[PDB]
Amino acid sequence: PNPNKQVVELNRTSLYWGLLLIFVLAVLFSSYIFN
């Protein structure tokens, strides 16, 4: 069995936080990655 296991919890606010972070980094770094 798995005596110590916890499913990861990622609420809606954390979802939007992560999506915003990823998209902001993408818009910031695309101009350099494309170069």
Binding site: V7, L10, N11, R12, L15, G18, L19, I22, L25
Partner: peptide, 27 residues
Amino acid sequence: NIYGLTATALFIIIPTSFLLILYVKTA
């Protein structure tokens, strides 16, 4: 730039999919 386009697409895809599947696991 094929390399840059592929990298940007991957960076958009994989973390978004990871976060979305995490949300589906527990909302």
